[PDB]
Amino acid sequence: SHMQQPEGVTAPGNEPMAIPSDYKLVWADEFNTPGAPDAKKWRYDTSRNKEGWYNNELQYYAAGRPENVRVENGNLVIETRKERLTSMADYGGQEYSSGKLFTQGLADWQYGYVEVRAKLACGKGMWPAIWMMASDGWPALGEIDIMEMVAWDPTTIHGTIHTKAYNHVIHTQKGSRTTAADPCGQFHTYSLDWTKDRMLIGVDGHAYMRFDNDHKGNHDTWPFDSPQYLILNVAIGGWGGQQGVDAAAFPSKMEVDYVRVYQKR
Ligand SMILES: [Ca+2]
């Protein structure tokens, strides 16, 4: 797998990453309170349930539904299921349910070190992601994909950014990829180090992706001087379904041990 980068990477990184010495934890969820996610930290995204999600995706994102989003045994669980939730008011005809949480309108950050420790969702069809979008159109406002994986190639981790100049609508996105051991069976830490000068995206303290601010003051190539909010989801189909959907793979879970955000303060 590759995010339209068949014969190389467009934003190569190869350097260590770690929480900077002058940073402090400014936000966390440790997911140690069973039941629904803390509503002071997380909202459900239902914005396109009735309209249809993007990317040829197949899922309906259920809100307030423990079968799809629950805190359990020290993790956030986002679970995909093969089912039609036809009596939801915003039902959109989908054959699958999943979860999509975000901090939009509750918590956002400009610059910082973001660490998300997770075990991913497997089974052909699955497309787990950990990513960010600007609080204040798209893609000009900036998108930061800290972690994507597509479960037809479940050991490949993808790290990508999108801007007006560099984005998947015109196939000019800046990204890289790496290999992680059994990501659906063991935890890894997926990390972003975002400063005014560059972003690093990594796994387990190794940056495999680097995107520099070109310092031209062009918002089209660097929109990332404004706050972003965090997003956790498991999509179904689209890129995740490039080799089909495995009916037998459902239900499939992503387990998030924690989200930690650090900043200079
Ligand atoms: Ca935890």
Residue numbers in the entry: -1 to 134, 138 to 266
From the article:
SCLam, a GH16 member derived from a soil metagenome, an endo-β-1,3(4)-glucanase (EC 3.2.1.6), can cleave both β-1,3 and β-1,4 glycosidic bonds in glucans, such as laminarin, barley β-glucan, and cello-oligosaccharides. The enzyme SCLam has the typical β-jellyroll fold of GH16 family. The substrate-binding site is located on the concave face and is composed of the catalytic residues E144 and E149 (defined as nucleophile and acid/base, respectively) as well as other residues responsible for the substrate anchoring. All structures have a calcium-binding site with a Ca2+, heptacoordinated by a hydroxyl group from the E28, G72, and D258 main chain; D258 side chain; and three waters.
The crystallographic structures of SCLam and SCLamE144S were determined at resolutions varying from 1.5 to 2.2 Å. All structures have a monomer in the asymmetric unit, and all amino acids from SCLam were built in the final models. The unique difference is the presence of a glycerol molecule, modeled in three alternative conformations, at subsite -1 and the position of the N-terminal loop in SCLam. Owing to the absence of ligands, the N-terminal region in SCLam is fitted to one end of the binding cleft, with the residue M1 occupying the subsite +2 and part of +1. In contrast, the N-terminal regions in all SCLamE144S structures are solvent exposed and exhibit multiple conformations. Although SCLamE144S has been crystallized with 0.1 to 0.2 mM magnesium chloride, the SCLam crystal was obtained in malic acid and all the structures have the same electron density representing the atom. Therefore, the Ca2+ probably came from the bacterial host.
